[PDB]
Amino acid sequence: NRPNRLIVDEAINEDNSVVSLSQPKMDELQLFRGDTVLLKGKKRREAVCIVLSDDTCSDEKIRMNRVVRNNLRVRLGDVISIQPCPDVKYGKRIHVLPIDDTVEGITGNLFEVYLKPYFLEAYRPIRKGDIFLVRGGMRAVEFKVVETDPSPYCIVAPDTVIHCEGEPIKREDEEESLNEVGYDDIGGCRKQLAQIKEMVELPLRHPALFKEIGVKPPRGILLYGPPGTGKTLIARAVANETGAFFFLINGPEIMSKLAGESESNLRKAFEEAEKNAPAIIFIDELDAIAPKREKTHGEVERRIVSQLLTLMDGLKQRAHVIVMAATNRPNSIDPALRRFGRFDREVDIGIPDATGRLEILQIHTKNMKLADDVDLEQVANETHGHVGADLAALCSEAALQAIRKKMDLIDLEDETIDAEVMNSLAVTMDDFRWALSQSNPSALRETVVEVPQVTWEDIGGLEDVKRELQELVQYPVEHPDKFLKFGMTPSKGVLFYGPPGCGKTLLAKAIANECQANFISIKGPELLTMWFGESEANVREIFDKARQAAPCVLFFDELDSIAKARGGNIGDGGGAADRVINQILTEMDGMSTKKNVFIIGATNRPDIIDPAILRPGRLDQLIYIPLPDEKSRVAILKANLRKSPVAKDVDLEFLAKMTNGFSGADLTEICQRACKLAIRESIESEIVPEIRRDHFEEAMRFARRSVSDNDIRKYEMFAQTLQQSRGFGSFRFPS
Amino acid sequence: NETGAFFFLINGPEIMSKLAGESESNLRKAFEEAEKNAPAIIFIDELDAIAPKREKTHGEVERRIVSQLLTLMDGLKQRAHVIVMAATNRPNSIDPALRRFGRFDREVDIGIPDATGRLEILQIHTKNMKLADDVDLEQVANETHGHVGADLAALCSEAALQAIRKKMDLIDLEDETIDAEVMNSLAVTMDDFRWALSQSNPSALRETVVEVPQVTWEDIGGLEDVKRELQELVQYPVEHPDKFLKFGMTPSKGVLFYGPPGCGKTLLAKAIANECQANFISIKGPELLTMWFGESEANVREIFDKARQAAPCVLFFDELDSIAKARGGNIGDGGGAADRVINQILTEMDGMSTKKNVFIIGATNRPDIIDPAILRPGRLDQLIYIPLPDEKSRVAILKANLRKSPVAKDVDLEFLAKMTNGFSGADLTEICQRACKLAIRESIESEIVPEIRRDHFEEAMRFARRSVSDNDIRKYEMFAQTLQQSRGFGSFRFPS
Ligand SMILES: Nc1ncnc2c1ncn2[C@@H]1O[C@H](COP(=O)(O)OP(=O)(O)O)[C@@H](O)[C@H]1O
Ligand SMILES: Nc1ncnc2c1ncn2[C@@H]1O[C@H](COP(=O)(O)OP(=O)(O)O)[C@@H](O)[C@H]1O
Ligand SMILES: Nc1ncnc2c1ncn2[C@@H]1O[C@H](COP(=O)(O)OP(=O)(O)O)[C@@H](O)[C@H]1O
């Protein structure tokens, strides 16, 4: 029973010590707003924390932080006892004793500079036997007392004094190093860590569950992603925060020894893990271990692969161990390792997007401090092609510029140095600007896979097609019973056409943002490259990665690019069938219907498109996007002008009604050209931050009309051909 | 295990994982120890990585093993009783030297289980536990098509973990010791299987699916004239061989039927496979265009090789004119009507054994651009023309397509069928799908009646499409008279 336990859950707030509760929880423990919560761990220890009351952020979950995880030896999937302590205690005497384990490189008095201007207006409670970290000196040191006033009676108050003895105590191995990598050190990966969280804690946190049940436990997990995404970091964290022996083998040192003992080393590596149960085995790289694709040289390289296959094939129950492997791309792993019982679980981690990169800036900067005008939100927005390790490299090399630009005008060069200056290292905005403009990204030409910020308000007008996309995307994933009962299979994909520059890409991105689903962008040149080069297998990986990145939505921009490059309507003697779209068809037909992977096709010349892709089953839903009317052009202009500063006397209705045959891009280029004039005038006047009517009057003289009446009637003749309201279109049936 | 013989298993990686010099001795002693423990049996888990004498060709260390295996199975005289069993993944990875007589003469192929096969294996991996009364395995194995046998076992195991995770989260029975009186309450619900199956990753999804469909003769509305034709050419030579043999007339090798698109050419081929309790292979248009653009011409060899060994079976070549359409069609370039893929189909069709009950069905919609070389007597001589459905058969088509959907009693189908003149089979099915769209959307909107009324059909009929215009009509009458030719002496009473 005991209806007071709280299950440990993942924390989303990057705060110091705050616990979120529910409305009924205050009335059960009669606790006030700010109280002293007492927690019972094991081995007769207590912990103190600060509770926060909120009924908007969380509903019935706790937010337990890592500052008290190591102070109570409590991990994920464990129960705890909560108890209020309304007793009022004011500490007046405390004892401090540094341990001779991490005091290297630290000189002078560090308490008076790091602890005095940090605990004011904080009232943080402390207890004998707590490990807490501080942010100072471009690092983070720990503290642990061994003899002080009887617990508790410990409150940080200004009346306390300082003292020194000079006789450090020897540390013990009972506790672990809290500085090691944990679950709070990985950001920008919510969906990928969730799968690991829901497959690793079953056979490790509760080993006794699996000796009694006959359920097959997962034995091998394969990690993916470009180099530097953090495959090693995740494996190090999931083993350090679970309580299992982590054994790491890189792979080059396996193959660096003489031929004959590498196999013995690999065998003993697996053998030593079984006795140290629970245990875990992680392989840093696997492509250079089993390159049975194109290398095929020497039995020395095949003996290792055979030994690994033998070692993971014979992994019966016996003990509890999980073999984790990481690589860079699936096209470099021996398929013999992908069989069942060796590597059946494959997880892919992609490039973090703007909301993901900002989440990982903080981990690599929390050890230091910045200025008040320097914000990491904007610095991670315009970058798109940076891997996780690129951010860490950028921060490190920005710190060096900070100190270089600080000591040049000071010239504090002498015999010895003092520790009271390196705490003043503050990174400015220009430091990050120059450091980022100088950084060299690693991966920049991959299929970027991210969820855009674009919403339905970005697309002006087109209210008729918004509901159409909603009713074909959101419905089959929200009401499967209603679709299943009527006995009608959901639409596999939608292709919409129309004149260029009308929001076909924005429509596809909005339906991905609204569904909280992933998005893949395949442009025209991305599809022309695989045609000229006779590289036809490149379409296999697109669908393979889209399927595994579920949920997701495909996008095939300007599918008629091959037809345009081949001649179009007539061209040569050939018809309308090509090789790339042919390979798209056989992969589209082979997709599983249940999976929530949608395909969106975009084109502007449907007359030269392949009729074979129009058949019912692959792309049957067609949406025609006409030119915006006067009603929607005002919305398009005002949506495009939200970011730019626009004056109050700028009338948009007249401007929108003045343009008759103008598409969406024609209105955006007008705004860009108007911004050009304002920027140029502002620069010239330096030797007003607003856009007036004069800027638009001059910009409208350079207006372009890409869609002429030549492009107009090419679509009415197509719409009537596809609709065909003749014969019996509008007739009242007697029955 | 169920015969009473000593089972000896060798994987193959541990054979090649030891130092060079003792692996051959281990393999030899493995064969030698089986003879003394008679009766015995030898099974090799994988053989492609044991004898990769196709493209690897590196080192005598890898050829010594192959030679040792060949020596050990070549010298298997009577002496004792032992059977060497080997498994692999695909025939294109085995040394042909092992396929000789006396080493591996018996080849058996096991395909992907279909809906009736997968349901049969759900029960084995779930009998150890119990489910709820509303959870049924019949429907869960129906919509899946690309799952291997081990995929089902993996899916069940990972659904069980979700069951316990969703059960102990709200209970939190975490203490020092555990009791055995709770794990018997582990019941798997429907949403558990739904999320587990939607999250599973199938292994094989782009193979030639080889299965027997559920489709029957009642699914195809009308076309009573062509049903008997297919019966009399498929079921007869396999049922009365003596009657065919006595008259001295060889059975028809294959049948190609043509007609406008969307008229049941695929369903006709599938029904004749279901009725004969025979296997079925489906080769679509893109499946045939892929082997043409890529200059991969040997891919047609394996199709016929696996069709022959999967006897009884029926072939299907959908839209055979796809290569001609992609090449230009009637005129195109200066070339004629002969290509490479259909050329390789001809040499494989001529080489088939007549006795084997492997039928070939060809489907096309533009017979004017088809290769005349495939029309010759001997390969595809029987031609069936499938015209547009009449008023009599459109009612049957609509009522057959509407069996699954809930249809109200006041929905008249005869008027709807007689209202459409130039509508093919797919034109009637898209109307029903569009009518179901409106009912589903109205049902969802009204949430904030489970039936289809006349209003749903009235609105859906406004969006009706007529794919087959009169442009596509007379292109077939001119062909039918050319092939039939009742002129000169068509209808004349002979005195003798
Ligand atoms: N998502 C991430 N969050 C935080 N740090 C990351 C992330 N991805 C990469 N890093 C940084 O990259 C460094 C090394 O990359 P790592 O992942 O260890 O190698 P690999 O990418 O090959 O697994 C880590 O020490 C970590 O600081
Ligand atoms: N309806 C619209 N609402 C807002 N912006 C639009 C609209 N149509 C076009 N644009 C602008 O034109 C640009 C090009 O639109 P795009 O999505 O590329 O359409 P398409 O791909 O069909 O040409 C967009 O980046 C957007 O700024
Ligand atoms: N005679 C018919 N009876 C039932 N359904 C039909 C019929 N003709 C066409 N259909 C429907 O039209 C769709 C297309 O039929 P299909 O098998 O492709 O024939 P074809 O290949 O000649 O177009 C089928 O999925 C089927 O539901």
Residue numbers in the entry:
A (entry chain E): 21 to 707, 728 to 775
B (entry chain F): 260 to 707, 728 to 775
Sentences from the paper on this structure:
The human AAA+ ATPase p97, also known as valosin-containing protein, a potential target for cancer therapeutics, plays a vital role in the clearing of misfolded proteins. p97 dysfunction is also known to play a crucial role in several neurodegenerative disorders, such as MultiSystem Proteinopathy 1 (MSP-1) and Familial Amyotrophic Lateral Sclerosis (ALS). pmcp97 is a member of the classic clade of AAA+ ATPases and is an essential cellular enzyme. p97 is composed of six protomers forming a homo-hexamer with an N-terminal domain (NTD) and two tandem ATPase domains D1 and D2 (1). p97 is an essential protein in regulating cellular homeostasis from membrane fusion, Endoplasmic Reticulum-Associated Degradation, Mitochondrial-Associated Degradation (MAD), Chromatin-Associated Degradation to NF-κB activation (2). Critical functions for p97 include the translocation and restructuring of proteins from large cellular structures such as organelle membranes and extraction of ubiquitinated client proteins to facilitate their degradation through the ubiquitin-proteasome system. Here, we present cryo-EM structural analyses of four disease mutants p97R155H, p97R191Q, p97A232E, p97D592N, as well as p97E470D, implicated in resistance to the drug CB-5083, a potent p97 inhibitor.
In the p97R191Q, p97R155H, and p97A232E mutants, the primary variation in conformational outcome as compared with p97WT is observed when the D1 and D2 domains are both occupied by ADP. In these mutants, the ADP-bound conformation of the D1 domain displays many of the structural signatures observed only upon ATPγS binding to p97WT, suggesting that these mutations shift the conformational equilibrium toward promoting ATP binding. This effect is most readily visible in p97R191Q, with p97R155H and p97A232E displaying similar effects in the D1 domain, but of a smaller magnitude. Residue A232 is located at the interface between two p97 protomers, and the introduction of the glutamate at this position will result in steric repulsion separating the putative hydrogen bonding residues T127 and T436 of the N and D1 domains of the adjacent monomer, respectively. This disruption likely accounts for the increased flexibility of the N-domain and also results in a shift similar to that of p97R191Q in the loop region between K425 and L445 of the D1 domain adjacent to the E232 residue. Of note, a T127A mutation has been reported in an individual with FTD, further suggesting the importance of this hydrogen-bonding interaction for the function of p97. Our results demonstrate that the effects of the N-D1 mutations are mediated chiefly through the destabilization of the N domain in the ADP-bound state, either through a loss of interdomain interactions in p97R155H and p97R191Q or through inter-protomer steric effects in p97A232E.
